[PDB]
Design an enzyme around this catalytic site. Structure first.
Site, short mmCIF file in Angstrom:
data_model
loop_
_atom_site.label_atom_id
_atom_site.label_comp_id
_atom_site.label_asym_id
_atom_site.label_seq_id
_atom_site.Cartn_x
_atom_site.Cartn_y
_atom_site.Cartn_z
CG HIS A 112 46.28 48.85 51.64
ND1 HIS A 112 46.01 49.66 50.55
CD2 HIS A 112 45.56 49.34 52.67
CE1 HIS A 112 45.16 50.60 50.92
NE2 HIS A 112 44.87 50.44 52.20
CD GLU B 296 44.85 54.23 49.00
OE1 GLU B 296 44.57 53.01 48.98
OE2 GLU B 296 45.12 54.89 47.98
CG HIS C 130 48.24 53.62 49.79
ND1 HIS C 130 48.19 53.84 48.43
CD2 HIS C 130 47.87 52.33 49.98
CE1 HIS C 130 47.80 52.73 47.82
NE2 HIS C 130 47.60 51.80 48.74
CG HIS D 117 50.83 48.18 48.80
ND1 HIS D 117 50.11 47.03 48.58
CD2 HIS D 117 49.93 49.20 48.75
CE1 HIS D 117 48.83 47.33 48.41
NE2 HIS D 117 48.70 48.64 48.51
CB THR E 166 42.84 52.15 46.54
OG1 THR E 166 44.20 51.79 46.78
CG2 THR E 166 41.95 51.58 47.63
CB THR E 167 46.21 51.49 42.31
OG1 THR E 167 46.30 50.07 42.49
CG2 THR E 167 46.82 52.20 43.50
CG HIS F 200 52.33 53.39 40.75
ND1 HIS F 200 52.56 52.28 39.97
CD2 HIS F 200 52.00 54.40 39.90
CE1 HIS F 200 52.39 52.60 38.69
NE2 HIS F 200 52.05 53.88 38.63
N1 LIG Z 1 45.82 49.69 46.94
S1 LIG Z 1 45.37 48.18 46.53
O1 LIG Z 1 43.89 48.15 46.30
O2 LIG Z 1 45.72 47.22 47.63
C1 LIG Z 1 46.23 47.69 44.98
O3 LIG Z 1 46.00 46.29 44.75
C2 LIG Z 1 46.57 45.88 43.50
C3 LIG Z 1 46.20 44.42 43.21
O4 LIG Z 1 46.69 43.59 44.26
C4 LIG Z 1 48.09 46.01 43.57
O5 LIG Z 1 48.59 45.18 44.62
C5 LIG Z 1 48.46 47.47 43.86
O6 LIG Z 1 49.88 47.56 44.07
C6 LIG Z 1 47.73 47.94 45.12
O7 LIG Z 1 47.97 49.33 45.32
ZN LIG Z 2 46.98 49.81 48.71
#
Ligand SMILES: NS(=O)(=O)[C@@H]1O[C@H](CO)[C@H](O)[C@H](O)[C@H]1O
Ligand SMILES: [Zn+2]
EC number: 4.2.1.1
Length: 257
Positions: A116, A103, A93, A91, A195-196, A61
């Protein structure tokens, strides 16, 4: 399973994760003229001096850079936060074009990408327990715009060829996350969610006002990654962002006027 395509994208998530239509979903559009300056907010404290990166992984992803969170090495404190939050991973987006990818949006403006930095509340013992709490996570969001290159990001860009496909991971030690931060720490904050999927509503979002600049060459390398695993038909990893969700009964606070 879930993804960002036409058949498994954000519009479909609510079927397996009903919380997708919940009361505090993220991301959201930040209307700068509706956010309230909160002089009560404490100074934001980002202590990444002892950050210990371990590995970089392509999870199908996006790609995550993981850190050792067994001690209070790299933490986030202050601001709207009560207690200590440990950095566990970061990570991004991004989009297929420079006009989209982030986002969160600012007055409906979309940035090329969004970083993020995920942190969890130490009072809960471990990440797994933290995501089950309304104040379990604190995510620092940083917008990326295309312009000059970001030195602190080149190390990440240089290793992407080694994790082109889903499941691939590479050693990524001695990386300093402080090199990804903008000059100013002014921010907006609101209670939200991941957000996932599973889209858990356990996040205190802290979104920085000042974006960082990355070069066209750097973003292009992000767009060369694959959603698919080795040997499978190629699907470029692009547009892995969820669109803005209804703010509903929430107020966005600003740390600046
Ligand atoms: N996009 S996000 O809300 O930081 C989402 O968080 C999750 C729980 O930590 C995971 O880290 C996902 O990889 C991340 O996209
Ligand atoms: Zn994220």
């Amino acid at each position: 399973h879930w993804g960002y395509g036409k058949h498994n994208g954000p519009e479909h998530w609510h079927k397996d994760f009903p919380i997708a239509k919940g009361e505090r979903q993220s991301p959201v559009d930040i209307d700068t003229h509706t956010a309230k300056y909160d002089p009560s907010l404490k100074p934001l404290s980002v202590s990444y001096d002892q950050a210990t990166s371990l590995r970089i992984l392509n999870n199908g992803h996006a790609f995550n850079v993981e850190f050792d969170d067994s001690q209070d090495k790299a933490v986030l404190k202050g601001g709207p936060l009560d207690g200590t939050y440990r950095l566990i991973q970061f990570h991004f987006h991004w989009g297929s074009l420079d006009g989209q990818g982030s986002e969160h949006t600012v007055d409906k403006k979309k940035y090329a990408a969004e970083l993020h930095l995920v942190h969890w509340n130490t009072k809960y013992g471990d990440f797994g327990k933290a995501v089950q709490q309304p104040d379990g996570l604190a995510v620092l969001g940083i917008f990326l715009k295309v312009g000059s290159a970001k030195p602190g990001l080149q190390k990440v860009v240089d290793v992407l060829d080694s994790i082109k496909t889903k499941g691939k991971s590479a050693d990524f030690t001695n990386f300093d996350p402080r090199g990804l931060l903008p000059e100013s720490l002014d921010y907006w904050t609101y209670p939200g969610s991941l957000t996932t999927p599973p889209l858990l509503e356990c996040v205190t979002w802290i979104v920085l006002k000042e974006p960082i600049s990355v070069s066209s060459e750097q973003v292009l390398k992000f767009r060369k990654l694959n959603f698919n695993g080795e040997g499978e038909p190629e699907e470029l990893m692009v547009d892995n962002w969820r669109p803005a969700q209804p703010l509903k009964n929430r107020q966005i606070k600003a740390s600046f006027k």
